Enzyme design. Sequence first.
Site, PDB file in Angstrom:
ATOM      1  N   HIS B  88      -3.048  -2.929  -0.679  1.00  0.00           N
ATOM      2  CA  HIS B  88      -3.322  -3.544  -1.975  1.00  0.00           C
ATOM      3  C   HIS B  88      -3.267  -5.062  -1.830  1.00  0.00           C
ATOM      4  O   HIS B  88      -2.396  -5.601  -1.148  1.00  0.00           O
ATOM      5  CB  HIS B  88      -2.296  -3.111  -3.020  1.00  0.00           C
ATOM      6  N   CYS B 130      -7.092  -3.141  -2.616  1.00  0.00           N
ATOM      7  CA  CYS B 130      -7.256  -2.750  -4.012  1.00  0.00           C
ATOM      8  C   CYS B 130      -6.193  -3.394  -4.901  1.00  0.00           C
ATOM      9  O   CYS B 130      -6.379  -4.497  -5.414  1.00  0.00           O
ATOM     10  CB  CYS B 130      -7.180  -1.227  -4.136  1.00  0.00           C
TER      11      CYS B 130
END
Lengths: 170, 196
Positions: B88, B130
């Site tokens: 992430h 992400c």
Amino acid sequence: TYQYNMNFEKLGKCIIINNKDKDAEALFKCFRSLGFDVIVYNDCSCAKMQDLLKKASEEDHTNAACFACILLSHVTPIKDLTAHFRGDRCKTLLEKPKLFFIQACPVEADFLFAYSTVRGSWFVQALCSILEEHGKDLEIMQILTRVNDRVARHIPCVVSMLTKELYFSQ
Amino acid sequence: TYQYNMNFEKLGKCIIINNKNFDKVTGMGVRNGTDKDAEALFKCFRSLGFDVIVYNDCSCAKMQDLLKKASEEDHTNAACFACILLSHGEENVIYGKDGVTPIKDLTAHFRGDRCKTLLEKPKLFFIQACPVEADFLFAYSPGRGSWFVQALCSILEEHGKDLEIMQILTRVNDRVARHFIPCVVSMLTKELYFSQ
């Protein structure tokens, strides 16, 4: 579908912003040397660049193939200029590339960038020396990476959000 | 010549960092399908002469300590060097199992002055979340893998030996945008095809 379409009337409209002159004059010649509709702007009071761009964003580029712009500084936010030519924001430029050349001291697809920093500079000196010679027979990336080679022989990044290759037909 | 030198003993390394399960104190979701995303890439770059190494659920100190130790290696017999990230991320930053490290800190280990073994050699970096910084290239980007990854190898095992990276990456950018966009920042100095 592996390159950008070029069966168009005009190549594209080139915009040159010049706050402060050799580089500009040299960029002018060498971009008109590709078949660009080039327009130069000096002493741009930062309110200018905004309205100046948006105007071109509301113009028609249906008979145009692409669009280029060039900035030259030493106060205006980067993104607040480019967003005028978003996905929906300028529908005449879809499946058409947007090329922003910079030197100071869906949406967002088909964009290209190049920022350099400091007679005139190298990057500029270097670039034109290619576009005059190998301009109309190379893919854009093949060109910039050649400039980085040339400037390193004496560095500017290059953001590519493109989708197809880019040469310069009619 | 107008292209990078591939006449080397080996190609280069290929560090893959598969971050799936992060700690609870981060408050960060379990990135799923990333096992598939890694296996795809690993299998892909394997078939391209990359000695592939896959790391899993690493701390930030690890990801830091790792690349540094890899930058301090002997890359002489190697043509290039790759590193692929799966985690992430946010504004020029990327998550580890424990915390968050600035991306520019990880790559810095290879800056020409602190990794002379890779000078004039391309030092690549792929991000799915992400002559200072010369010869650098960055390509930031369910049940099946992601689009990007699945679409990349889809193009990479198919054309990877006979196309330049831009020709590869520009191609990738079209098929991901075809479904519905990644940014490829390049500081290279010569064209790079993946064969001899």
